Amino acid sequence: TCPFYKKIPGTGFTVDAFQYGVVEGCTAYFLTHFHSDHYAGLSKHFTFPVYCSEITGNLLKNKLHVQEQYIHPLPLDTECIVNGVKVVLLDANHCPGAVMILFYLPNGTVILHTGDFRADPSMERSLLADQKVHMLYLDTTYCSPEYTFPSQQEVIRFAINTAFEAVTLNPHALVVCGTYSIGKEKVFLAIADVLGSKVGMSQEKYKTLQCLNIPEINSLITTDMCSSLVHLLPMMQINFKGLQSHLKKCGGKYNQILAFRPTGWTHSNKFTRIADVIPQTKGNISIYGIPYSEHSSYLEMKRFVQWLKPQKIIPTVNVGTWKSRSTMEKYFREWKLEAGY
Ligand code: NI
Missing domain, CATH: 3.40.50.12650 (Rossmann fold)
Structure with a gap:
C-alpha cells in the first residue's frame, strides 16, 4: 500500500506514488523527476492529472507515451494554484528536470518535499528564504558522516x-x-x-x-x-x-x-x-x-537543514530498516541541539 511519507496531509496529493494503483483520495499525482524508482507505474494508460516540470513532461510524452491531456507542466520559481492549493517548484540540483515542491496548506502549514536533491548554499536565496517551513520530506540517501x-x-x-x-x-x-x-x-x-x-x-x-x-x-x-x-x-x-x-x-x-x-x-x-x-x-x-x-553529502544535508530549521523531518530514503531509521533520527536531534531550534 502507499506509504505515509508519499502523502501530503490536508491535501488530496501524492508525490512519486505511481506504483500502488488508484490511491484512494488522490486528486493530483506529482512527479519530482524522471528516475525509474520514482515514475514506476506510469504509461499511456494513465488517466489522472500528473504535475511536474517541463523537462519531466517532455520525457513522459516521448519515452513513456503518456497522453498530453494528463501532463500538467509547471514553470519553476512561480506561485501556481493546483486543486485549490498554492504550490511552487524549485530546482533540486539533481538530474535534468528534477524539482523540490513547496506546498502552502489552507491551514497555514508550509511543507517542503525535496524529491531527490543535492543541497547547495544557492538554495538559501531562492523563494525558500521568504517564509518559514514547518515540515521537511527529506532525501536522506547519504545521511551518515562517512559520506x-x-x-x-x-x-x-x-x-x-x-x-x-x-x-x-x-x-x-x-x-x-x-x-x-x-x-x-x-x-x-x-x-x-x-x-x-x-x-x-x-x-x-x-x-x-x-x-x-x-x-x-x-x-x-x-x-x-x-x-x-x-x-x-x-x-x-x-x-x-x-x-x-x-x-x-x-x-x-x-x-x-x-x-x-x-x-x-x-x-x-x-x-x-x-x-x-x-x-x-x-x-x-x-x-x-x-x-x-x-x-547531498552528509555535510551539505546538515547545512541545509540547520539553515531551514524545520519543526518536523520525514525521511524518504533508507526508511526500510529500524537501525537506519533510528540512526537518522539521532542525527536530526544532534543538528537541532547544535543550532538551537
Ligand atoms: Ni533520483
Whole structure:
C-alpha cells in the first residue's frame, strides 16, 4: 500500500506514488523527476492529472507515451494554484528536470518535499528564504558522516585533464562513459568538448537527451558512432569483457580504451582524495570509478537543514530498516541541539 511519507496531509496529493494503483483520495499525482524508482507505474494508460516540470513532461510524452491531456507542466520559481492549493517548484540540483515542491496548506502549514536533491548554499536565496517551513520530506540517501565527496567541479576537472592527457599521448585511444538513467551529463559532455568530438550513442539514449532542453545539444551529441571518439554505453557494459567486445566492433580504428563509471559513493572516499584516484587496468583497457554525486553529502544535508530549521523531518530514503531509521533520527536531534531550534 502507499506509504505515509508519499502523502501530503490536508491535501488530496501524492508525490512519486505511481506504483500502488488508484490511491484512494488522490486528486493530483506529482512527479519530482524522471528516475525509474520514482515514475514506476506510469504509461499511456494513465488517466489522472500528473504535475511536474517541463523537462519531466517532455520525457513522459516521448519515452513513456503518456497522453498530453494528463501532463500538467509547471514553470519553476512561480506561485501556481493546483486543486485549490498554492504550490511552487524549485530546482533540486539533481538530474535534468528534477524539482523540490513547496506546498502552502489552507491551514497555514508550509511543507517542503525535496524529491531527490543535492543541497547547495544557492538554495538559501531562492523563494525558500521568504517564509518559514514547518515540515521537511527529506532525501536522506547519504545521511551518515562517512559520506564525503568532492564538488562536482573538482570531479569534472579530474575527468577532463585525464582524458585530454590520454588522447594527446595516444590519438588512437577511445573514451567510453557509462550511463543507465538521465543525470551526470556534464561527465561525457565536458570530456567531448575538450577533445573536439561529439558524443556517440544509441538511438534510444539520443532520443532521451533530446528531451532535456540543453542549449546547443545538436552541436554536442550524435548517433554516428564512426564520427565520434567519446562513446556512451550502458553502465552494465563498463567492465573488461564488455569493453574488449566494444573495441572489436570499432574495426581497428582504436587500440586502447579509457572508460569512466560515475558511481555515487564508493569507500575509496573514506581514505582517498580525488587527486589520488587510479584506474583498474587489464591490457589496453583502463576503467576509472569517479565519485560524481547528484545527492547531498552528509555535510551539505546538515547545512541545509540547520539553515531551514524545520519543526518536523520525514525521511524518504533508507526508511526500510529500524537501525537506519533510528540512526537518522539521532542525527536530526544532534543538528537541532547544535543550532538551537
Ligand atoms: Ni533520483
